[PDB]
Write a protein that binds this ligand. Structure first.
Ligand SMILES: [Zn+2]
Lengths: 8, 267
């Protein structure tokens, strides 16, 4: 539910 | 959001649990290349290209060149007025029974070098390795990290891939392991350490004041940390040279280098 490290 | 310092300084005068969240702006102000864009490149790539398990799997030599560059370059970098102000702030408010915690997205250890104690490095460190065979995490300040990387890692494009074979990349020194080392850095597509995340949770839950300093709030989940604090009504102060996708969710927005505003803001 917490997501993996990402760039949005 | 407001840009009134007098009003920020009210909350700050009385705050007992300050959470200071920092990003690459703070490191950029020390001269640390953060390869963010729109002109943060190493050869022809940026962090989001090379800081990935795919990049490491397909070209472990090139990823190691990149982090080697970044390790070496730190020899001449010092913490800046923003780092010092954060560190002294902690020291000072400490004496008064008041809590200051730093939650950093940066992997360069400048907050530590400045004297920061309560430090959560949510994406790891340039000066730590993890063995991909046994999982041991070790500090590593060695210059060069390995012999085959001596003289490598040059950032100019056109620069040839060193193509070190994996046997000559950094290897685990635990007796009989021999495994290939990687940087102990959270890459895009990987999870933050859940133990670190639970800490961060505890800090955000219990804070009465929050600063978000030199982050462009596009890196997740770190980008959600401050908005979450503003969502229990707690004032968040964004310190940044620019505005971000998160700006209008916060109480304050102070423009300019964190090195200029923070020493005033945390005096
Ligand atoms: Zn090992």
């Amino acid at each position: 539910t917490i997501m993996p490290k990402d760039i949005q | 959001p407001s840009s009134s310092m007098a009003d920020f300084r009210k909350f700050f005068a009385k705050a007992k649990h300050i959470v200071i969240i920092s990003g690459a702006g703070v490191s950029a102000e020390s001269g640390v290349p953060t390869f963010r864009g729109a002109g943060g490149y190493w050869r022809k790539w940026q962090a989001q290209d090379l800081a990935t398990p795919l990049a490491f799997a397909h070209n472990p030599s090139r990823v190691w060149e990149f982090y080697h560059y970044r390790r070496e370059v730190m020899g001449s970098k010092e913490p800046n007025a923003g780092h010092r102000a954060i560190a002294e702030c902690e020291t000072r408010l400490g004496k008064q029974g008041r809590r200051v915690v730093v939650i950093t997205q940066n992997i360069d250890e400048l907050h530590r070098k400045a004297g920061t104690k309560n430090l959560l490095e949510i994406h790891g460190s340039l000066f730590k390795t993890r063995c991909t065979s046994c999982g041991v995490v070790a500090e590593n300040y060695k210059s060069p990290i390995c012999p085959a990387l001596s003289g490598k890692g040059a950032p100019e494009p056109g620069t040839q891939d060193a193509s070190i074979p994996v046997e000559k990349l950094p290897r685990c020194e635990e007796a009989g392991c021999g495994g290939l080392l990687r940087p102990h850095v959270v890459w895009f597509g990987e999870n933050l350490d859940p133990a670190i995340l639970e800490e961060v949770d505890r800090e955000l839950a219990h804070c009465d004041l929050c600063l978000v300093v030199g982050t462009s709030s596009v890196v997740y989940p770190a980008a959600m940390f401050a908005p979450q604090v503003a969502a229990r009504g707690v004032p968040v102060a964004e310190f940044n040279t620019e505005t971000t996708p998160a700006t209008n969710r916060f109480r304050f927005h102070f423009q300019g280098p964190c090195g200029t505003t923070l020493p005033e803001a945390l005096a």
